[PDB]
């Protein structure tokens, strides 16, 4: 299962924190800090599947964002990496360009996209065209 999804930046600010299990108050901040410390050190010539504690994260760089899904030990590795890429591409075709400014100014749209394609810790939807169609059909309706 997916433990949490993060969309960090180069500095360390969390542009999207989405936890799928109950963590403590300071535990969330400690996890974010240590995930940032682990991810930032590595570079392109490294595996994206870095493990820590009892879990493993799936970090993928995109411009100035570090998308990270933390999965269980037994969960597959490449599938969630491609789920990250699919999520990034849905954002890219939704905002017409993905950037920190759009995430900051439209945080609730990011939350509804995440809950559209990542629900209860598993992969709710795996397609781009159908998600975009269902989101546009649920955007003109107000």
């Amino acid at each position: 299962m997916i433990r949490f999804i993060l969309i960090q930046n180069r500095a360390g600010k969390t542009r999207l924190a989405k936890w799928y299990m109950q963590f403590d108050d300071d535990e969330k901040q400690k996890l974010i800090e240590e995930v940032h410390a682990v991810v930032t050190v590595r570079d392109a010539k490294h595996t994206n599947f870095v493990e820590f504690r009892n879990f493993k994260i799936i970090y993928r760089r995109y411009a100035g964002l570090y998308f990270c899904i933390c999965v269980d030990v037994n969960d597959n590795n490449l599938a969630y990496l491609e789920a990250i890429h699919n999520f990034v591409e849905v954002l890219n075709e939704y905002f017409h360009n993905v950037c920190e400014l759009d995430l900051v100014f439209n945080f609730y749209k990011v939350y509804t996209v995440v809950d559209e394609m990542f629900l209860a810790g598993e992969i709710r939807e795996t397609s781009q065209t159908k998600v975009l169609k269902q989101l546009l059909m649920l955007q003109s309706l107000e």
């Binding site: 299962m1 924190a17 109950q22 010539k45 490294h46 595996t47 994206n48 599947f49 870095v50 493990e51 597959n76 590795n77 490449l78 599938a79 990496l81 491609e82 789920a83 890429h85 699919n86 900051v104 100014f105 945080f107 609730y108 939350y111 509804t112 809950d115 629900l119 209860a120 810790g121 598993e122 992969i123 709710r124 939807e125 795996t126 397609s127 065209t129 159908k130 269902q134 649920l138 309706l141 107000e142």
Partner: protein
């Protein structure tokens, strides 16, 4: 569109040090508090703007303890956006209250009594994104009523499946198993594809909990998988991820099949074997796109298939093809593929059907261990090398492990030395090599070896009774090294005190020089090492009667009799009294037997498991 958020976040972003940000955020909090209290704030849009601003205030990193009743009031509305913002706020901020939780439950219950997929989906997302005992109690029998074969749209079906998954994950005892299993199982054969994904996730979790309930789903999963892997070039184009048909769904179906024993029906097993063969053959085909994502999809499906084959452990030809594919991947240009192939082959090596095929790739595994000089890839190579170790191949593996231990960073030094010790102990043909390997570990790592490696080596030397001479010798010519670790000092003290007679024949190994070097190493050691050396001394008292005078002159001095440690003082006084009484009818009896050590529980494996 919303106008207040744009200006508010624009103002709060380009701010000075935390003082100005705190001032601005507190001013906005005061303004919103004044707006919430009284006034004509009955308009829904104003409540929306205030709730969104407050949510951003919370997510910025500041604590929020108000504006909750006026926010849950947004749920009772007909505008979609108000409901969405209210649900998002409830999901983000969670508090334990009696009236508030009851009001939220009433609002959600009213929401579920609708006829549009949007409201039902929003309510389901609100239920599943937080999870609570009250929600499960008030909706244990409502989610299956959605998932049952009623007139519901596909999106709400997927949402309900995942919500039931979450509720079972958080409230296992509140989920019944009524007459809806026969509907969820047949739901996996339903049209559409995301619905199959959600149903497969739910069924996988439930079968991992109660396997016997969903035995019917295996055949349906096999049929769906065999139809997906080989369907057409562009059939169901909504789900072809870079010319690979539904990688995530195939991974989910293989995960579901993994949690079950091999299918009983010969036809189902035949279709499964044909599907796996097709997956392997398509993985051997050249890519249809030069992009890396197509290769990622193909390799993800392939590794899931390989994991399924390993778990089943029933097809020998399939396992051989799996080993060949992993060997081909071991030299892949990609970095993720190498690490994942190492992990998969480490899993596969336990299967006896292809142990020789796994062992065949030892040259590539060793070259990987020595070449890319990574931190995770090399650790996986270490684990894989530990996996294939056998009696005929122990020598090369242990030598390469030691060579890696020479230049390995010290964070992983303990696991490697424990692995080397257990491998030498378990796969030794002649125990002289085992003693040599243990002494090499002591010399090379020393500081990071273990608590219980030298325990095991002393136990082995005492029990086997055939390698005692060589062990005592190599210990003697290892002690006289200029710098030696104190673990070697303890081992040498015990081994000499037990087998000084076997090497006493050599004039160069006279008891006098042994005692002199032991006393020289005695001055600089910790207290337990000095206790071990005192026990060795009392063994030498009777084992060598000629060195009795020198020993007595050693431990009768004020260094040991007047020591400030209870252990050393007690040992010294007891040993001195035993030497002084000089009866010799009791000393030779007490200090000569030391019967062999039975294998208690193999503590090295226990410690290795507890560390990982």
């Amino acid at each position: 569109g919303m106008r207040g958020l744009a200006v508010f976040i624009s103002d709060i972003r380009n701010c000075k040090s935390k003082e100005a940000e705190i001032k601005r955020i507190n001013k906005e909090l005061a303004n919103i508090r004044s707006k919430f209290k009284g006034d004509k704030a009955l308009d829904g849009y104003s409540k929306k703007k205030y709730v969104c601003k407050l949510l951003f205030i919370f997510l910025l990193g500041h604590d929020i303890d108000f504006g909750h009743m006026e926010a849950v009031n947004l749920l009772s509305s007909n505008r979609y956006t108000e409901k969405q913002i209210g649900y998002l706020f409830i999901s983000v901020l969670v508090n334990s209250n009696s009236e508030l939780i009851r009001l939220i439950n009433n609002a959600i219950k009213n929401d579920l009594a609708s006829r549009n997929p949007t409201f039902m989906g929003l309510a389901l997302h609100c239920i599943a994104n937080v999870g609570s005992r009250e929600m499960a109690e008030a909706f244990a029998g409502e989610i299956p009523k959605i998932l049952v074969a009623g007139d519901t749209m596909d999106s709400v079906k997927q949402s309900a499946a995942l919500c039931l998954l979450r509720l079972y994950r958080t409230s296992p005892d509140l989920v019944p198993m009524g007459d809806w299993t026969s509907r969820v199982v047949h739901l996996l054969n339903d049209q559409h594809l995301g619905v199959v994904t959600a149903a497969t996730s739910l069924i996988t979790t439930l079968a991992q909990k109660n396997p016997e309930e969903f035995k019917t789903s295996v055949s349906l999963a096999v049929s769906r998988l065999s139809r997906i892997v080989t369907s057409a070039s562009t059939d169901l184009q909504d789900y072809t991820y870079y010319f690979v048909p539904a990688p995530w769904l195939s991974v989910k179906l293989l995960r579901l099949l993994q949690c079950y024993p091999p299918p009983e029906d010969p036809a189902v097993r035949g279709r499964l074997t044909e599907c796996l063969e097709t997956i392997l053959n398509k993985a051997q085909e050249p890519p249809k796109s030069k992009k890396v994502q197509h290769s990622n999809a193909k390799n993800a499906v392939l590794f899931e298939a390989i994991s399924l084959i390993i778990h089943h452990d029933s097809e020998p030809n399939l396992l051989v093809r799996a080993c060949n594919q992993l060997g081909q991947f071991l030299q892949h240009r990609e970095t993720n593929l190498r690490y994942l192939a190492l992990e998969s082959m480490c899993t596969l090596a336990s299967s006896e059907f292809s142990h020789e095929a796994v062992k065949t790739h030892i040259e590539t595994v060793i070259n990987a261990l020595k070449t890319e000089r990574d931190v995770s890839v090399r650790q996986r190579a270490v684990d894989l090398l530990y996996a294939m170790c056998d009696r005929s191949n122990a020598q090369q593996i242990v030598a390469e492990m030691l060579s890696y231990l020479e230049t390995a960073d010290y964070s992983i030094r303990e696991e490697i030395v424990l692995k080397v010790a257990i491998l030498a102990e378990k796969y030794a043909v002649d125990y002289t090599w085992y003693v040599d390997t243990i002494l090499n570990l002591i010399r090379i790592a020393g500081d990071y070896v273990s608590e219980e490696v030298w325990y095991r080596v002393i136990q082995i030397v005492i029990n086997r009774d055939d390698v005692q001479g060589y062990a005592a010798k190599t210990v003697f010519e290892a002690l006289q090294a200029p710098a030696c670790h104190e673990n070697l000092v303890k081992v040498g003290g015990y081994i000499l005190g037990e087998f000084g007679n076997l090497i006493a024949g050599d004039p160069r190994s006279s008891p006098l020089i042994q005692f002199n070097l032991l006393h020289s190493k005695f001055h600089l050691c910790s207290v337990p090492t000095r206790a071990l050396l005192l026990s060795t001394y009392i063994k030498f008292v009777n084992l060598f009667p000629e060195v009795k005078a020198t020993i007595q002159d050693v431990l009768r001095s004020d260094s040991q009799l007047k020591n400030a440690d209870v252990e050393l003082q007690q040992r010294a006084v007891e040993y001195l009294r035993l030497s002084t009484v000089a009866s010799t009818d009791i000393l030779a009896t007490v200090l000569e037997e030391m019967p062999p050590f039975p294998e208690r529980e193999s503590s090295i494996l226990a410690k290795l498991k507890k560390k990982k």
